[PDB]
Amino acid sequence: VSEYELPEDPRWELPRDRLVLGKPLGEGAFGQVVLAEAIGLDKDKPNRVTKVAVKMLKSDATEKDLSDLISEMEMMKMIGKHKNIINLLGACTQDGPLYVIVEYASKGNLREYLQARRPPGLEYSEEQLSSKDLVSCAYQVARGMEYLASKKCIHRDLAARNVLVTEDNVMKIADFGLARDIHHIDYYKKTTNGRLPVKWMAPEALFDGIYTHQSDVWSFGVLLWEIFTLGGSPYPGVPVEELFKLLKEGHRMDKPSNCTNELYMMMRDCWHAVPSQRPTFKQLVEDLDRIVALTS
Structure with a gap:
């Protein structure tokens, strides 16, 4: 992954401004999760904000940490929605840190x-x-x-x-x-x-x-x-x-x-x-x- 530069997917891409970061949730090992507010996810009611969890690289990230994040994102793309699986809500993939946005x-x-x-x-x-x-x-x-x-x-x-x-x-x-x-x-x-x-x-x-x-x-x-x-x-x-x-x-x-x-x-x-x-x-x-x- 040390230079497989991430492509774009308009279906899942969410602009970074529509994301507001706050308290940290999880911690350790391969990454870091913070609690955040997401502006207009479902689009059809586009001014309500949703409480969501954001997965991102932590401080001293390694190549494999990044690889794991990317892979998690794509895998959740393939799997699809299910009642008993934390499903993908969005992603920030361009011009900044990789943000995988999932259900809270x-x-x-x-x-x-x-x-x-x-x-x-x-x-x-x-x-x-x-x-x-x-x-x-x-x-x-x-x-x-x-x-x-x-x-x-x-x-x-x-x-x-x-x-x-x-x-x-x-x-x-x-x-x-x-x-x-x-x-x-x-x-x-x-x-x-x-x-x-x-x-x-x-x-x-x-x-x-x-x-x-x-x-x-x-x-x-x-x-x-x-x-x-x-x-x-x-x-x-x-x-x-x-x-x-x-x-x-x-x-x-x-x-x-x-x-x-x-x-x-x-x-x-x-x-x-x-x-x-x-x-x-x-x-x-x-x-x-x-x-x-x-x-x-």
Whole structure:
């Protein structure tokens, strides 16, 4: 990207004056997000302003940070609108910093959201959620991922921290900087040493560098475990340095406390050693729907 100079796309281009920057939201690693006001997005009612989130490069940006930003933008162009995916609102691509303008989620990411609602239990440290609530979180994220897979897209970074919660408590998948398009190819091969959090990586992705929708399913299993620990961190006590060996020996996380055996069996299913023997996101959606219907 050190000189692939960005083209223009009038469909998505929003002039920089129609954007007013304010408080910073997220931080760290590959970029930076600030809260902003956008003047006349939907056009047909062009004098109202919308609260939006703006992704941009941070202070000491690297080539790959920029590459990731651009890629996130284009990927979100390809994916399209869906109820459970933070969708693209616009972009500032010419004559200044790259600005990727996306939907704003007032209630933060799923991990924070879940941790803010932990009952005063012994396995821990707002108002609590019912079982049907959590299972509905799982269901929503599953819908989003099913849609992603229908569009031949691999997220590669599916985790609680990358799921956002809206004002109406809707789940919306975010962070597409590492997302890859696998239209008309069997898999995606990763660089020699990856840039994705190890504890969410499927074994075939960690050891062999193969990414498919199935590895995303693995990640979703870890996400289930995160949801029903109400924001716990995967493989508690286990340092990354020691996870490898464990995974190569068949180690799997235990059943979280407040969790049915059906859901833990779903987690274990997502964590199958053989990728092809894992459920698809469609099957996961069907299952989670069935379970939602049988819960209160």
